Subunit: 253 residues, 3 copies
Amino acid sequence: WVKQYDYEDIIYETYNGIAKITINRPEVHNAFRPKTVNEMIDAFTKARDDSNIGVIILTGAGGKAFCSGGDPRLNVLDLQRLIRVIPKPVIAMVAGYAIGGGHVLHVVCDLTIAADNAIFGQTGPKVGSFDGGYGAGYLARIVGHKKAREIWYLCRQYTAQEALEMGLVNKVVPLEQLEEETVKWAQEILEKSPTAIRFLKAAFNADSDGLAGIQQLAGDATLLFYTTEEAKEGMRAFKEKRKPDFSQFPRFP
Amino acid sequence: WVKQYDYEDIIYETYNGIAKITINRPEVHNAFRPKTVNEMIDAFTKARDDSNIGVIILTGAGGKAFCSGGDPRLNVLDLQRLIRVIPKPVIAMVAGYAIGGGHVLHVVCDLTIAADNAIFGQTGPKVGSFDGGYGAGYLARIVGHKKAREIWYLCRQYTAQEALEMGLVNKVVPLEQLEEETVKWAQEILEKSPTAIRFLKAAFNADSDGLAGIQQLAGDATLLFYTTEEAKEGMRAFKEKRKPDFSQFPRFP
Amino acid sequence: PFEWVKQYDYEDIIYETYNGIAKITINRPEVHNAFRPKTVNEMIDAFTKARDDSNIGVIILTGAGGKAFCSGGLNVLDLQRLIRVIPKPVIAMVAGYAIGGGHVLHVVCDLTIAADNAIFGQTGPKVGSFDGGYGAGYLARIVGHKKAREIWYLCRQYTAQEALEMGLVNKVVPLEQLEEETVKWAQEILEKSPTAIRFLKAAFNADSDGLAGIQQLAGDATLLFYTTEEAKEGMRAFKEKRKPDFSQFPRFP
């Protein structure tokens, strides 16, 4: 990993197309405060524009904590949306605690790889808080409504195996092989058509986000369209102060 | 448990913040007729209005039947909606049969704790009936479309263990421990912030019910708003006949 | 046992009927039952034939050999919609490979019965393509977003047992008993109300297809309504050049 920029509350490194973002607050079990969130925003954005990065990993430094949520601007919501809009798969690498806002964060990541020591759960109803956005509805679109309501109403803790069984995480491995497996998964992704991946991610987002999700799927198509010759004719003619000729191009039943 | 009002087909009892509504027709496996549904709507309404009650348990009497379903009018549909709109978590405590209309009832309940003798399944297609509302789509949002379509199309019966494995119920325990476990889960919820829970339940309902769901979520936000200094300024400035002063209060944002 | 009656003449497929059951077999084992425009067109035709045959109440889709259901390839998009609009349950009988477009086909079928040798998976981002329609959102509505995004991003293969465990298929049995089991399930559906079934299937589709799903659900309501005295009066009165009298029919709440 090559430490790429200089952050305070987190760490940003890269390697062979993979970008890893690490919350670094083991003292408070990698909890997040307004500042550390803003840094994650900047970092993801950095990875977003970096055409050499095709996959992103999110993890905690502790070794026994991924994130435990936060310590009065609700900027994590902005990060949740960002993680979903980035046209690149985001893998949450979970070790130890993934609680509260921290659990919602691993939830919105495309995939989650957990160490056998990982602990999952919400805390809101206990400490006077709640995430009724992706934290509720999207979670229910992963584990189903009975389990999602259980998770929020009782605020119990769930081990990796429990998480795996309910479809909350994609895989569980010993703590010592966590990053090894995660990088393995990241590389497999780096071998696929990047455009085919961004389109599917958008399609998955459109599944639950109405027009917001359609803006993403339709947006990507607009991007791809500007690539075609047909599209070129459009702005070419505009510049040439003439009427464009699309008949030159084909249709498709 | 302390019994209060006098219902004929059901029993209403409360205990340290828990309201337990019991369908009392063991001779027909706690199947429901218009009368018993009307009373359940009444009882659920009483539990709704009791500021001491925070969780509601729904169950059947006698050990081998939660509810066998319906014995014109289809008032259970009104009950399903009430169950979902009440700001308090409702737990289906299933012992034995939860069939047909009865199965949909345990389904719309937030959580379900089942005894090892519990039997699950739909019967509509067999007996000339069907529930394509929460009975279909919502069931699919718990067990998945493949499993949900299987349940309705073949109308087979499922064990408690099979129900657990597909995510249909939250927990399974021997018949002798059912109520203790259910009460235990209820008390755990009773230790949480009532407002946190109602907002979470509304958000979950908003995930699948469009505007009807948003009305619940937005409505709670209004109730909450009425508790602020900002809103009261408007109410009083509407009682004092003077242009309200809102710049007085902060922006978050 | 079962003697299928081949009923037409197709090049890439085979259409046979037993007794209430229609079976459509992709017959291009040389390319692991991969489909080309023609085989898709032939499937559209065959499914349409099963749709109009009032003696068919269930449909089976399968691959010719015992090592492939379909291995994949747009007009297949029309097929997907057809399989869903047809008011009869469709059962994918999977032996061997169910990959790429072939995996989506089994996915959209109401139920899936797989042989222990069945293999499932997507190959979109590997072979240059993707299915962001039912291929993504609907799959997510079966196995959850975490798993669905995993299936598409890594394009790995999944055994019959792994597909069962994640709710992707309904049942798994030894290769030699595949049809026997499938037919068994089909005959169970056949003894159910055809009308109750079509309404539930329509309701399931309405769960995720907005106005398109509602068109199907309302459409069946319309069809039913036509066989009522109330409706016939409106018709009769129109033919008799007189104003209708619906007062002779009961209101209901």
